[PDB]
A and B are shown apart, each in its own frame.
With several copies, the nearest count.
Chain A
Amino acid sequence: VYKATRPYLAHCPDCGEGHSCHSPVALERIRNEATDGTLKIQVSLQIGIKTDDSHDWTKLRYMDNHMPADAERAGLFVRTSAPCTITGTMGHFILARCPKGETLTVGFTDSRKISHSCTHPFHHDPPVIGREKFHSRPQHGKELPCSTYVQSTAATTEEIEVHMPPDTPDRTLMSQQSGNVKITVNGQTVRYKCNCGGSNEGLTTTDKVINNCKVDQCHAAVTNHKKWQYNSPLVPRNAELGDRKGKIHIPFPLANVTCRVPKARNPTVTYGKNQVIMLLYPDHPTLLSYRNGEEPNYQEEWVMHKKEVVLTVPTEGLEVTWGNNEPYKYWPQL
């Protein structure tokens, strides 16, 4: 599919130090529907594909001003408040596990070095899967339903809209001959507009001259028609053609899977008159929930350290859930 598509330059509000630029690593959309915390990031460049369209996981292709160029995959980075763990890369898409943050940055290195990054404001604080706030994923634990973007290269379900490109502006395409405008195409498709009479349209594959016109009165931009590009709101629509659209399948779709969650240790239990006393010893943050009959009166609290809890056990009964453990049931003696 990459023989028809190409990497592109698009608007980025922060290319470094809060300054806007026409970025070759521009952020399109950040997807966070995966309950496991995995982020599906869409970028303007294409990872795992070379300029000759061949697939190479160690390579990356980005739009280098006028034409696409090759870059290293090792130089690609994703960061929020601190660096992210990249779990998968293919074309315009990146899969990443990020720590808590308020911004999202995606960057890379060219050939002559020069780091290019794109920062977008994004609130990232993924919700807890289960009832325990843990750091590392365990081998064994309670099987809970969760969603993730699959690591697989294959593109069969999800899709994006594509169309013929817009116009990379380039003033070097025009020159004064001798007091008129000369547009030298250089084997490309160039869209030109001049503030002069006669001819000022196209989209041309050949050299054009505008007599008795000034170079400042004209506008030149790389043309096309032979390639496809993502239907980006950061790139203008092709004026000549109408609402002509194409569509391509995308890697890493969202799917229902299973997430392994840890547990804890049964607290030392002591009983009293219509009440239960628990000495909680958590090794990590653990959710403690309880309910009564007709009036359940649900209450919950995240237990961080050593805490003694005194709970009233009514005649109808009391159900207590301590982390990922099965609920404990308590009843008073007649």
Chain B
Amino acid sequence: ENTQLSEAHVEKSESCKTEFASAYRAHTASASAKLRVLYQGNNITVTAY
């Protein structure tokens, strides 16, 4: 008439703040590029969306 109650569950490990993977929904990529332009014998840098 002696019984043993076994209990178990699965929460985030202490490592979750350091070792983790992120699941993202990627949509509509924004293209950017700085175009070096040889303008009037000099190189000019243009950074635009």
- The interface on chain B, measured as residues whose beta carbon lies within 8 A of the other chain's beta carbons, has a size of 5
Taken together as a complex, chains A and B put the C-alpha atoms of A57 and B49 apart, in Å, by 61
Taken together as a complex, chains A and B put the C-alpha atoms of A158 and B14 apart, in Å, by 6
Contact A256 B14 (CB under 8 A): no
| A157 partner residues in chain B, CB cutoff 8 A | 14
Question: Which residues of chain B (1-49) have a CB below 8 Å from chain A?
Answer: 13-15, 18-19
| B18 partner residues in chain A, CB cutoff 8 A | 147, 254-256
Q: Does A33 have its Cβ within 8 Å of any Cβ on chain B?
A: yes
Taken together as a complex, chains A and B put the C-alpha atoms of A255 and B4 apart, in Å, by 38
| B13 partner residues in chain A, CB cutoff 8 A | 33
Taken together as a complex, chains A and B put the C-alpha atoms of A157 and B17 apart, in Å, by 11
Contact A147 B19 (CB under 8 A): yes
Interface footprint category on A: under 10
Question: Which residues of chain A (208-256) have a CB below 8 Å from chain B?
Answer: 253-256
| A256 partner residues in chain B, CB cutoff 8 A | 18
Taken together as a complex, chains A and B put the C-alpha atoms of A32 and B13 apart, in Å, by 12
Q: Does A159 have its Cβ within 8 Å of any Cβ on chain B?
A: yes
Taken together as a complex, chains A and B put the C-alpha atoms of A141 and B13 apart, in Å, by 31
| B14 partner residues in chain A, CB cutoff 8 A | 157-159, 253-254
| Per-position 1/0 for A247-269, Cβ under 8 A of B | 00000011110000000000000
Query: What is the CB-to-nearest-CB distance from B13 to chain A, in angstroms, rounded to a whole number?
Result: 7
Residue of A nearest to B5 (CB): A237
Query: What is the CB-to-nearest-CB distance from B20 to chain A, in angstroms, rounded to a whole number?
Result: 11
Query: What is the CB-to-nearest-CB distance from B26 to chain A, in angstroms, rounded to a whole number?
Result: 18
Query: What is the CB-to-nearest-CB distance from B4 to chain A, in angstroms, rounded to a whole number?
Result: 8
| B19 partner residues in chain A, CB cutoff 8 A | 33, 147, 254
Residue of A nearest to B4 (CB): A236
Taken together as a complex, chains A and B put the C-alpha atoms of A147 and B15 apart, in Å, by 10
Query: What is the CB-to-nearest-CB distance from B16 to chain A, in angstroms, rounded to a whole number?
Result: 10
Taken together as a complex, chains A and B put the C-alpha atoms of A158 and B18 apart, in Å, by 12
Taken together as a complex, chains A and B put the C-alpha atoms of A253 and B14 apart, in Å, by 8
Taken together as a complex, chains A and B put the C-alpha atoms of A290 and B40 apart, in Å, by 42
Query: What is the CB-to-nearest-CB distance from A306 to chain B, in angstroms, rounded to a whole number?
Result: 38
Question: Which residues of chain A (145-170) have a CB below 8 Å from chain B?
Answer: 147, 157-159
Residue of B nearest to A35 (CB): B19
Question: Which residues of chain A (74-99) have a CB below 8 Å from chain B?
Answer: none
Taken together as a complex, chains A and B put the C-alpha atoms of A256 and B15 apart, in Å, by 10
Taken together as a complex, chains A and B put the C-alpha atoms of A256 and B13 apart, in Å, by 15
Query: What is the CB-to-nearest-CB distance from A232 to chain B, in angstroms, rounded to a whole number?
Result: 13
Taken together as a complex, chains A and B put the C-alpha atoms of A110 and B14 apart, in Å, by 33
Query: What is the CB-to-nearest-CB distance from A250 to chain B, in angstroms, rounded to a whole number?
Result: 9
Taken together as a complex, chains A and B put the C-alpha atoms of A255 and B15 apart, in Å, by 8
| A147 partner residues in chain B, CB cutoff 8 A | 15, 18-19
| A159 partner residues in chain B, CB cutoff 8 A | 14
Query: What is the CB-to-nearest-CB distance from B25 to chain A, in angstroms, rounded to a whole number?
Result: 23
Query: What is the CB-to-nearest-CB distance from B9 to chain A, in angstroms, rounded to a whole number?
Result: 12
Query: What is the CB-to-nearest-CB distance from B6 to chain A, in angstroms, rounded to a whole number?
Result: 8
Given contacts A147-B18, A254-B15, A255-B18, 7 further A-B contacts (CB under 8 A): A33-B13, A33-B15, A147-B15, A157-B14, A158-B14, A159-B14, A253-B14
Spell out A's residues near B (CB within 8 Å): 33, 147, 157-159, 253-256
Q: Which 7 A-B pairs have the closest CB atoms?
A: A158-B14, A33-B15, A254-B15, A256-B18, A254-B18, A255-B18, A33-B19
Q: Could you list 16 examples of A-B contacts with CB < 8 Å?
A: A33-B13, A33-B15, A33-B19, A147-B15, A147-B18, A147-B19, A157-B14, A158-B14, A159-B14, A253-B14, A254-B14, A254-B15, A254-B18, A254-B19, A255-B18, A256-B18
